[PDB]
Amino acid sequence: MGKDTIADIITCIRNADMNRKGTVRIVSTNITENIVKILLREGFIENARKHQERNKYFLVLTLRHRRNKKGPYLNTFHLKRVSRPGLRIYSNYQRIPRILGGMGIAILSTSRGIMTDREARLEGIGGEILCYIW
């Protein structure tokens, strides 16, 4: 099926950090490769590379965990989509969300490219809010 490939990556990373795994393999698409790029520039993951299973192109996604405790603290506590297919959210320059007061950011696809919460405010542009990471 795959109704939204932008929504299954959010589910594949969220369930992977809860049961502490090293590498996850998600589907290869240009828009999803743009989300993993602005994830490592802020520092939410290690790095991203290209891979291939059986004629199908997949993307390597290595996660990062903190120090050892009873249950080691995770990088991303919650991952959720705002612009769900069938409920498309659109915002301007003033309606841009302030996630956690500056600690967490919200990644949005703008007209100039792919900007974050701080990057879209400095350019003076808005668009479709994909998801919010914290």
Binding site: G86, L87, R88, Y90
Partner: protein
Amino acid sequence: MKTMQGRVVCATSDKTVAVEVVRLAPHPKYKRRVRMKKKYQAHDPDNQFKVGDVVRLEKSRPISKTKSFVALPVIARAARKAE
């Protein structure tokens, strides 16, 4: 003047064509797209445009009480159901 596009559903009328305009617009209270469809009675004195053709409608002089729009151009051919 305003321009709206739509498909012709009925052609069995003298010099008049029934054009169905589809318009997608988000709800101010909610967020998702609500589709509204209203049919306009356009003027066609040359009876060139038949059923299935997608034409654009512009505002003009009212030829009747229900008719106020005219069909000036044509963007594509027949996009209907097969006989």
